[PDB]
Tab-separated table of C-alpha atoms and ligand atoms in Angstrom:
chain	number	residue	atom	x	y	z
A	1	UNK	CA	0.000	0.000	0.000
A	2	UNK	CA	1.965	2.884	-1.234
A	3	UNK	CA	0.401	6.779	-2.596
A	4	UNK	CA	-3.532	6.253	-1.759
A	5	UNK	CA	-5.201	7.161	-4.798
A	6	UNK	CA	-6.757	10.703	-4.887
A	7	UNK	CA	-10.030	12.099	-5.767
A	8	UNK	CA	-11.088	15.251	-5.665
A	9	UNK	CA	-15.111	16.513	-6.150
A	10	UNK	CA	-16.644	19.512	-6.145
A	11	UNK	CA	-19.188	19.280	-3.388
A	12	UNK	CA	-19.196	18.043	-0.013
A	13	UNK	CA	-21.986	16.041	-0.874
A	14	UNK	CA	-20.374	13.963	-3.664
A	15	UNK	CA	-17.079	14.211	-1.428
A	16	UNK	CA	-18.978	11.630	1.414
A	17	UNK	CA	-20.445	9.394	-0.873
A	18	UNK	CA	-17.176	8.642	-2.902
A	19	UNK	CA	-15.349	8.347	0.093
A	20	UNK	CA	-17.905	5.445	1.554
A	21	UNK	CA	-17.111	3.991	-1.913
A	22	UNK	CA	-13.528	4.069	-1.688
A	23	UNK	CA	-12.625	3.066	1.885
A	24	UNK	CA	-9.495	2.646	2.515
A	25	UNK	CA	-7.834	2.475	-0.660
A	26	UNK	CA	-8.353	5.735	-1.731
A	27	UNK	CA	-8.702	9.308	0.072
A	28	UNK	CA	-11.255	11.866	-1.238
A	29	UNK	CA	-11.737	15.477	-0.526
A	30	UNK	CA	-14.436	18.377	-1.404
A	31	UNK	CA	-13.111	21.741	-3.338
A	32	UNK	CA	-16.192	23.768	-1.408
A	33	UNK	CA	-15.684	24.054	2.568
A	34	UNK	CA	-18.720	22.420	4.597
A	35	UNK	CA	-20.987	25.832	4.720
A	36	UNK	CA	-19.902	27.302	1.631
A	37	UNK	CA	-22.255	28.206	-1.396
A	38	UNK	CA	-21.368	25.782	-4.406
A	39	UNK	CA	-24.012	27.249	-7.420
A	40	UNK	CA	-21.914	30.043	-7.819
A	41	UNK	CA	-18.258	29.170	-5.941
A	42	UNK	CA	-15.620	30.742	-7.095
A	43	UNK	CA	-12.245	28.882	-7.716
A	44	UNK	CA	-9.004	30.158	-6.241
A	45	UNK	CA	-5.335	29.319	-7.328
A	46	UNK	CA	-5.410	26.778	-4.036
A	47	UNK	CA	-8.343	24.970	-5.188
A	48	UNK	CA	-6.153	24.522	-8.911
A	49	UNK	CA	-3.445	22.989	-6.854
A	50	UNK	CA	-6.185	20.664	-4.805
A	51	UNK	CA	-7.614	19.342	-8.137
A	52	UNK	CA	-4.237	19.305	-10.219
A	53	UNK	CA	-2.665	16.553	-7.461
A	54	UNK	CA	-5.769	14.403	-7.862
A	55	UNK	CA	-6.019	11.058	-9.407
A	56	UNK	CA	-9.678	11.485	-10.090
A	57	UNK	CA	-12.219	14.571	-10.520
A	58	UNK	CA	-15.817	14.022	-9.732
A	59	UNK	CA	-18.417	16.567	-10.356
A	60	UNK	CA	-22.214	16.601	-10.589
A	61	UNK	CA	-23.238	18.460	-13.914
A	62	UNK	CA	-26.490	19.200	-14.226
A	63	UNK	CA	-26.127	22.594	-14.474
A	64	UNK	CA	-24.746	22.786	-10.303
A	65	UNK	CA	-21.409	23.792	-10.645
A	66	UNK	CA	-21.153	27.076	-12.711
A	67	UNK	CA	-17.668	27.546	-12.296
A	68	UNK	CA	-16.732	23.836	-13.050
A	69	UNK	CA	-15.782	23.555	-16.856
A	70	UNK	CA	-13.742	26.961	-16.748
A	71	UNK	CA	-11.776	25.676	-13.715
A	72	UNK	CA	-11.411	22.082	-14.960
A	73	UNK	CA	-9.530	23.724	-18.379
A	74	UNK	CA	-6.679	24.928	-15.718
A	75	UNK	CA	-5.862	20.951	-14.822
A	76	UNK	CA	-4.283	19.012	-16.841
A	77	UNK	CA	-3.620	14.849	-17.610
A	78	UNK	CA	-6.755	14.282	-14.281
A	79	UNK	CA	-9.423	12.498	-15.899
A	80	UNK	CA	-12.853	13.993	-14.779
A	81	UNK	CA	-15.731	11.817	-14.696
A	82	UNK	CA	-19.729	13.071	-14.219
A	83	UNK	CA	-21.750	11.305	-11.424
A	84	UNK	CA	-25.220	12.187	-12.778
A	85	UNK	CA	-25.653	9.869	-15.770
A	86	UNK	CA	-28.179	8.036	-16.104
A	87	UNK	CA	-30.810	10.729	-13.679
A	88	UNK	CA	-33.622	11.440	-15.950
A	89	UNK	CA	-33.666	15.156	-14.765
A	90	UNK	CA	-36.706	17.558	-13.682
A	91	UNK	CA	-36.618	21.206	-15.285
A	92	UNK	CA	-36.182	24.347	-13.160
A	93	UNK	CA	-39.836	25.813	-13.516
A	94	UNK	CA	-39.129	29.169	-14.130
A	95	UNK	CA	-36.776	32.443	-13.545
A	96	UNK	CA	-33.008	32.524	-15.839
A	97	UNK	CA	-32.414	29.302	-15.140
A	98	UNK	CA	-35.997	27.995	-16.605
A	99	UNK	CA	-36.289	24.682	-18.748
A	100	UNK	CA	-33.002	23.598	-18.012
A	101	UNK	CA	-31.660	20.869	-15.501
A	102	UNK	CA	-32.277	21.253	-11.594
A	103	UNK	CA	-28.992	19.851	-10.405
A	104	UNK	CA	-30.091	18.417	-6.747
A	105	UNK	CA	-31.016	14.766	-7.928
A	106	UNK	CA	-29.257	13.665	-4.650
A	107	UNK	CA	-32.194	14.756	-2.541
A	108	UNK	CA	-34.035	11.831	-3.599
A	109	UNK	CA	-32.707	8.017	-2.655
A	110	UNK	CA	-33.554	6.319	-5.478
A	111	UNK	CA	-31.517	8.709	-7.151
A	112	UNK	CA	-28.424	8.470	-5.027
A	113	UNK	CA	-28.179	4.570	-6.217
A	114	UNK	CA	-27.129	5.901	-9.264
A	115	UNK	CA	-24.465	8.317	-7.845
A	116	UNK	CA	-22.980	5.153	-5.973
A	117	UNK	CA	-23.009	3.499	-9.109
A	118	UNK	CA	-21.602	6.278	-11.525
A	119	UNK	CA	-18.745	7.013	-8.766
A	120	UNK	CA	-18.215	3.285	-8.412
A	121	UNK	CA	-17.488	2.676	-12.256
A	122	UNK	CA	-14.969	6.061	-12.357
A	123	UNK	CA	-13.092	4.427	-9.369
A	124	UNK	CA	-12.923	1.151	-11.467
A	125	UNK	CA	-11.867	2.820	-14.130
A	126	UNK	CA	-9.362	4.895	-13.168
A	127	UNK	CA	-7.827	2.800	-10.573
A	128	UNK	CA	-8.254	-0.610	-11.533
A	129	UNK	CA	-5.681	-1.944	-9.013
A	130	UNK	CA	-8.294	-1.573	-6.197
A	131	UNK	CA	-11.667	-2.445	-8.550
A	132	UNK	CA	-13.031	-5.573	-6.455
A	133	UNK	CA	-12.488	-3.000	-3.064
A	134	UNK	CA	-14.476	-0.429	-4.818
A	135	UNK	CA	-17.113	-2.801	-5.805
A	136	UNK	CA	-17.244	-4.523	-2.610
A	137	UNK	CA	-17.590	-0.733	-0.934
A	138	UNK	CA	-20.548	-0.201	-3.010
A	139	UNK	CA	-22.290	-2.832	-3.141
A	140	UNK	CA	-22.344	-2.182	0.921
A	141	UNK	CA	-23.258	0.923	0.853
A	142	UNK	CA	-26.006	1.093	-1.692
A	143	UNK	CA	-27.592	-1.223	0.584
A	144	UNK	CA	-28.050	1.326	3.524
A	145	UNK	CA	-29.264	3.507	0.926
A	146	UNK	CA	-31.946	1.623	-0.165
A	147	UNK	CA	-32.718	0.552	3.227
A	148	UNK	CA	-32.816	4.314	3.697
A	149	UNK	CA	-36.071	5.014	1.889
A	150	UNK	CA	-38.463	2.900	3.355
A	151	UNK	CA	-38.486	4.566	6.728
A	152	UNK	CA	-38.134	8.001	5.139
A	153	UNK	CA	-41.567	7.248	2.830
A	154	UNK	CA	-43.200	6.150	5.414
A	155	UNK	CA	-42.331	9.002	7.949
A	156	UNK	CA	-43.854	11.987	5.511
A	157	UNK	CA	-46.315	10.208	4.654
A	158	UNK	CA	-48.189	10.674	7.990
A	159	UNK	CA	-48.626	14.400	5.987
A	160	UNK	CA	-52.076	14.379	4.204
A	161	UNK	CA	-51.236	14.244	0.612
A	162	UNK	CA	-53.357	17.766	0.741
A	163	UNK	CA	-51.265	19.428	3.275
A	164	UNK	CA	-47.967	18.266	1.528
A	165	UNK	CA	-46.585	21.831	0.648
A	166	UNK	CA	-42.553	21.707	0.966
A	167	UNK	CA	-41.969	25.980	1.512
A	168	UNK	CA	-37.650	26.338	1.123
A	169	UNK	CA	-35.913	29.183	0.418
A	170	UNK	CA	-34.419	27.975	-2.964
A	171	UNK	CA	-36.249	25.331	-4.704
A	172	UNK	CA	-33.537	22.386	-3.802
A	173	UNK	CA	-35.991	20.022	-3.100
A	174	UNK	CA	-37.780	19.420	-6.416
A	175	UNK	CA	-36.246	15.373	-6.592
A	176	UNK	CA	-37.025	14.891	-2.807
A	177	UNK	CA	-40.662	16.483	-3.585
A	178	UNK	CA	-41.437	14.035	-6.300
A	179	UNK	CA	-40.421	10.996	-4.704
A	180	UNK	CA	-43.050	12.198	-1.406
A	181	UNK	CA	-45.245	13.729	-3.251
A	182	UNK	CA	-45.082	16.938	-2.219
A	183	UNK	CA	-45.824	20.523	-3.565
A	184	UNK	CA	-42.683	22.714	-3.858
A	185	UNK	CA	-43.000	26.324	-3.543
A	186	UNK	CA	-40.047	28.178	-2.823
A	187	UNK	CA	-38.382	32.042	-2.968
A	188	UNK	CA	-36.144	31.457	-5.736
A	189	UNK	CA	-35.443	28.414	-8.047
A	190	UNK	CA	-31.990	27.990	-8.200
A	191	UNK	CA	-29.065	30.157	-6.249
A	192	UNK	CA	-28.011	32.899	-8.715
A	193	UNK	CA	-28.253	36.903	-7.746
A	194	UNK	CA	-31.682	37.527	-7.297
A	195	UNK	CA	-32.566	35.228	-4.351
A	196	UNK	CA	-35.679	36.996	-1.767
A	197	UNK	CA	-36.478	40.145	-3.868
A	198	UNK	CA	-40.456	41.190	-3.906
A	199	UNK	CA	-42.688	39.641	-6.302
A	200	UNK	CA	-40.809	36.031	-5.136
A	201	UNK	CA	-42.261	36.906	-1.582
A	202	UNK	CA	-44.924	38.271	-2.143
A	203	UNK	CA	-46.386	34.648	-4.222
A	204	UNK	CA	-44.861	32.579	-1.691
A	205	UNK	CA	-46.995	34.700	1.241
A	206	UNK	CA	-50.110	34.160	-1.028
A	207	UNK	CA	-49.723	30.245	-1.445
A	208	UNK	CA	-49.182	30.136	2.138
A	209	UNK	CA	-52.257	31.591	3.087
A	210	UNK	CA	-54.646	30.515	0.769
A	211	UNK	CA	-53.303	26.850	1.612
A	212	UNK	CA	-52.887	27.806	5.135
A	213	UNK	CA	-49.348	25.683	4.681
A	214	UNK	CA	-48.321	25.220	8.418
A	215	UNK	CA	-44.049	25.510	7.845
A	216	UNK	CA	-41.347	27.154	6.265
A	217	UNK	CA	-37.858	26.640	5.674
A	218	UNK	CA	-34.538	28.020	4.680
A	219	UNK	CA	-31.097	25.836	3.327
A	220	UNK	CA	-27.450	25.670	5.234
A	221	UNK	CA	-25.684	27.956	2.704
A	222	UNK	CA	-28.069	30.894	2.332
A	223	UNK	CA	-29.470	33.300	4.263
A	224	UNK	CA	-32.419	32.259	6.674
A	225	UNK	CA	-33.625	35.882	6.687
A	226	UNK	CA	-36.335	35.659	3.235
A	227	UNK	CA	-37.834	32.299	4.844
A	228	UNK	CA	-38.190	34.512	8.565
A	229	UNK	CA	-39.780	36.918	7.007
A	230	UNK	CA	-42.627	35.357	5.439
A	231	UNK	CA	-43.129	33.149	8.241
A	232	UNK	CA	-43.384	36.466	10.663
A	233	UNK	CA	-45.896	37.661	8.039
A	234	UNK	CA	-48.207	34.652	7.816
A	235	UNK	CA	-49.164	32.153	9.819
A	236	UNK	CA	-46.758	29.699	8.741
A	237	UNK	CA	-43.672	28.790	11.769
A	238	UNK	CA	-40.283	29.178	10.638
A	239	UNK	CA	-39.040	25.295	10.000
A	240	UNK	CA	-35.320	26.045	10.578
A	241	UNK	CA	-32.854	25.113	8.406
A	242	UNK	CA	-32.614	22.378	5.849
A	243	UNK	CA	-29.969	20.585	4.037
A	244	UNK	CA	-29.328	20.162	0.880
A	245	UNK	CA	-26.091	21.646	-0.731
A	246	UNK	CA	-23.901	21.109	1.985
A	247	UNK	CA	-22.974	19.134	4.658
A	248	UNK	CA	-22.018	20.024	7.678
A	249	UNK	CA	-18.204	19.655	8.994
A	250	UNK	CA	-17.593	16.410	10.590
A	251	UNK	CA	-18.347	17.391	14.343
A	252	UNK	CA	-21.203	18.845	13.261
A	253	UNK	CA	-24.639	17.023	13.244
A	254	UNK	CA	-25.052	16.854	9.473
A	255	UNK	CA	-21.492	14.897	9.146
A	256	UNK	CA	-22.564	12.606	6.162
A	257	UNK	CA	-24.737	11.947	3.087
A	258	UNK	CA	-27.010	9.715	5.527
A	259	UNK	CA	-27.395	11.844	8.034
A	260	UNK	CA	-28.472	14.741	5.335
A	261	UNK	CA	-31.130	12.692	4.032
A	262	UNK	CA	-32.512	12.103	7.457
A	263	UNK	CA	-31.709	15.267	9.388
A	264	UNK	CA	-33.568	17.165	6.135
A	265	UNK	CA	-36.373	14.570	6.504
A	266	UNK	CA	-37.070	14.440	10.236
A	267	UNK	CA	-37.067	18.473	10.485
A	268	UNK	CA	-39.802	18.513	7.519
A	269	UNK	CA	-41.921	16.129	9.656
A	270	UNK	CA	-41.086	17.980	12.858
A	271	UNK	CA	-42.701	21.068	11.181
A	272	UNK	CA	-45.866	19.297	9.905
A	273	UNK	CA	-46.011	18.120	13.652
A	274	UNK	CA	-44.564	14.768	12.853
B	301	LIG	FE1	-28.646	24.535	-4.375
C-alpha cells in the first residue's frame, strides 16, 4: 500500500459518498468548505493545486457547478468523470435558469443509487488496481441507501397528501418532492443573484395563506432571513434550516450523506407536527 489514490469533487456532498465507496484504498476530498455556497463558488489558485494533485475529478453536472468547466480547463492529464448519468432530470420551472436541468437529484434516494453506481465505475476505471475493493464498498453501501427510503416514505407520509406543501428558500428540493409527493414552492429556483427580492415573496406569502401551509424553511448555505420573514408575516412557523447543498463539517450534526437525508427529513416532519 503505497500513494492512496486521490479524488477530488466539487461538493461536499459527492465528497462523502465517494469516500464510503472508496474506503481505505483511496482518500477523497471536497473543493467547497462544509458551509460554503457551491451554485456560484468561485475557484481560487489553491483549489487549482487541490484538483491538479488528484487522481480522479468528480463533479455533478447538471447545471450545479457554474464555475466547473472553466476551472477544470486549468488541470491538466486528471481524468474527470460526471456522477449524474443516467438521472432522468426535472426542469427548473421558471426564472433565468428555466427549462433547463435542476442539479439536486441527490435529494431523492432512489436517485443516489445511481451516484454510488456512476462514482463506483470512475473508481474502477481509473484505478483498476483496487476495482473488487471499490465494488465490494458499493455494493455495501447502496444497501443502507436503499434501506434508507423505506423509513423516510413512510415518515412523511403521515402528511395528508393535501397538506404536503414543501416551503424552502431555494427550490432544492424538487427530486425529494417528487419521490413524497409533495408541492414545492419556494423564494427562488436555483441560487443565482436575485434570491428573496419582492414579487418572489410576495407569491410565496399568497400560497401560504390561501393553503394555510403550516411551515417554512430556509437551506445551510443561504441566508435564513427571506424564509423569517414570510413566516413572521403569515401564519406559517419558521421550520429552521434544511440541508441540501452542503454538509455540515464532521463534528457537526449533518457529518454525512445519511445523516443529510434524514436530518432534512425528520425536520420537515417535525414542522408538519410529525
Ligand atoms: Fe442549491
Amino acid at each position: 500500500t503505497a500513494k492512496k489514490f486521490k479524488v477530488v469533487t466539487t461538493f461536499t456532498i459527492i465528497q462523502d459518498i465517494a469516500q464510503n465507496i472508496a474506503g481505505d484504498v483511496a482518500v477523497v476530498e471536497s473543493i467547497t468548505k462544509p458551509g460554503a455556497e457551491i451554485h456560484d463558488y468561485q475557484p481560487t489558485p489553491r483549489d487549482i493545486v487541490k484538483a491538479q494533485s488528484a487522481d480522479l475529478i468528480l463533479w455533478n453536472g447538471m447545471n450545479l457547478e457554474r464555475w466547473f468547466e472553466k476551472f477544470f480547463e486549468s488541470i491538466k492529464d486528471v481524468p474527470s468523470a460526471v456522477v449524474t448519468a443516467g438521472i432522468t432530470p426535472l426542469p427548473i420551472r421558471e426564472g433565468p435558469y428555466s427549462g433547463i436541468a435542476n442539479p439536486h437529484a441527490w435529494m431523492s434516494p432512489s436517485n443516489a443509487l445511481i451516484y454510488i453506481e456512476n462514482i463506483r465505475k470512475a473508481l474502477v476505471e481509473h484505478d483498476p488496481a483496487h476495482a473488487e475493493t471499490y465494488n465490494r464498498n458499493a455494493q455495501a453501501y447502496a444497501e443502507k441507501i436503499k434501506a434508507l427510503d423505506a423509513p423516510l416514505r413512510e415518515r412523511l407520509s403521515r402528511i395528508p397528501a393535501e397538506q404536503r406543501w414543501l416551503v424552502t428558500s431555494e427550490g432544492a428540493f424538487s427530486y425529494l418532492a417528487k419521490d413524497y409527493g409533495f408541492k414545492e414552492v419556494y423564494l427562488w429556483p436555483i441560487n443565482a443573484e436575485q434570491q428573496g427580492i419582492p414579487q418572489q415573496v410576495r407569491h410565496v406569502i399568497d400560497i401560504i395563506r390561501e393553503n394555510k401551509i403550516p411551515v417554512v424553511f430556509s437551506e445551510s448555505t443561504i441566508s435564513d432571513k427571506p424564509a423569517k420573514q414570510v413566516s413572521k408575516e403569515t401564519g406559517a412557523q419558521y421550520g429552521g434550516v434544511l440541508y441540501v447543498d452542503s454538509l455540515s463539517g464532521e463534528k457537526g450534526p449533518v457529518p454525512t450523506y445519511i445523516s443529510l437525508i434524514n436530518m432534512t427529513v425528520d425536520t420537515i416532519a417535525k414542522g408538519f407536527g410529525q
